[PDB]
């Protein structure tokens, strides 16, 4: 669908404001809540234009974004219901893990590498990106431990 | 100078052939050696080709090439090609004069430890309009800065 947002990029603080205010306006997203039986994680587009993408994510316990960056996009997350783990990678291999629970939010600039997983079944969250999430990088590790980054189109 | 190439992005094997073919035609690059000093050999919608001359201290840092495949031919001297491992015990390979290698677009690497006065030819396809430069804070938490060439 469409939100009534400005015709410019939003910075990470404005993205955080956006996801929190959307959480306070269930009229904008309640209809799109859905938890898939199988397939991938359920993601509903609330808004996609030249400046901002907004998605509503409904989580099963097994859902896992994998390690990824957002190329040039800043981002923010608000947990509406439930809880998620925000993970940040450490070269040593002892990664940073933070539980983000309902009511809480965070933002990040474009250099962010993270992984969201460990969700309470039935969790609901709102995610916003500016500039739009037209590209993301997905990291993988081979047999040997060697790390790669696959650039993915997500427009 | 213009290059007779397919009118499309080239894969890592084709890029390796290209840098080795160019290394065999000194007429095309000899004049541009200089002591990283870099000379553009050809850039168009599909490929970026460079000649690089190395000082012993030169270091690319850890980086990816976003969507670009790449290849390297060492013409003289030697380079160290490093690939990152989770755990910190990175893979390091000396690439000596006469040797070349290539990689697809998911490659993360670092080039460094060059014998002083090394000369190499590098090719990318699609052109290297963007790259990712990795950094580590004192924590060890890694980030990727996306940079427009
Ligand atoms: Mg209000
Ligand atoms: Mn993300
Ligand atoms: Mn490189």
Question: Experimental method used, please?
Answer: X-ray
**Is the CB of B67 inside 8 Å of chain A's CB atoms?**
yes
Nearest CA in chain A to B91: A146
Q: Do A69 and B106 touch (CB under 8 A)?
A: no
The domain made up of B12-148 has a fold known as: Jelly Rolls (2.60.120)
Q: What long-range pairs does A43-49 form, CB within 8 A, spacing at least 24? A: A45/A1, A46/A1, A46/A3, A46/A22, A46/A126, A47/A1, A47/A2, A47/A3, A47/A5, A48/A132, A49/A2, A49/A5, A49/A132
Q: Which residue has the tokens 């993601």?
A: A43
Q: What is the DSSP letter of A27?
A: G
Measured from the alpha carbon of residue A73, the closest ligand is: 2
The distance of Cα A80 from the centroid of its chain, to the nearest Å, equals 13
Instruction: Tell me the domain boundaries of chain B.
Output: 12-148
> Of B42, B135, B144, whose CA–CA distance to A149 is shortest?
B144
Say how far residue B129 (Cα) sits from the centre of its chain. 14
Spelled out in words, what is the top-level CATH class assigned to the domain A12-153? mainly beta
Nearest by CB to B143, which of A113, A141, A149? A113
CB A30, CB A56: distance < 8 Å: no
* A130, A72 Cβ separation under 8 angstroms: no
Residue A1, helix vs strand vs coil: coil
Mutation target vs B (from A134, A145, A152, A154; most B CBs, 10 A cutoff)? A145
Residue B82: closest C-alpha in chain A: A146
The 10 Å Cβ neighbour count of residue A30 is: 11
Chain A interface, best mutation among B106, B130, B149, by max A CB count within 10 A: B106
A153 contact B CB<8A: no
Question: Using CB atoms, which residue from B64, B91, B146 is nearest to A146?
Answer: B91
The closest CB to that of A92, out of B107, B140, B143, belongs to: B140
3-state secondary structure of B12: helix
Binding site per annotation, positions of A for Fe(3+): 68, 70, 114
For residue B126, cis peptide bond before it (omega within 30 degrees of 0) = yes
Which phi-psi region, left, alpha or beta, contains residue A108 (left: φ > 0; alpha: ψ -120 to 50)?
A: beta
């Amino acid at each position: 669908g469409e939100l009534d947002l400005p015709e410019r990029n939003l910075d990470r603080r404005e993205l955080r404001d956006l996801v929190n205010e959307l959480a306070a306006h269930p009229e904008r997203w309640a209809e799109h809540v859905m938890f898939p039986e199988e397939g991938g994680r359920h993601y509903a587009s609330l808004h996609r234009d030249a400046y901002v993408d907004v998605w509503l994510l409904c989580w099963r316990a097994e859902d896992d974004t994998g390690w990824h960056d957002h190329d040039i996009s800043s981002g923010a997350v608000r947990v509406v219901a439930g809880a998620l783990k925000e993970c940040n990678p450490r070269i040593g291999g002892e990664h940073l893990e933070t539980v983000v629970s309902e009511g809480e939010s965070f933002s990040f600039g474009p250099d962010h590498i993270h992984r969201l997983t460990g969700a309470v079944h039935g969790s609901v969250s709102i995610h916003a990106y500016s500039p739009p999430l037209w590209r993301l990088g997905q990291y993988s590790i081979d047999d040997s431990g060697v790390m790669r980054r696959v650039s993915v189109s997500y427009a």
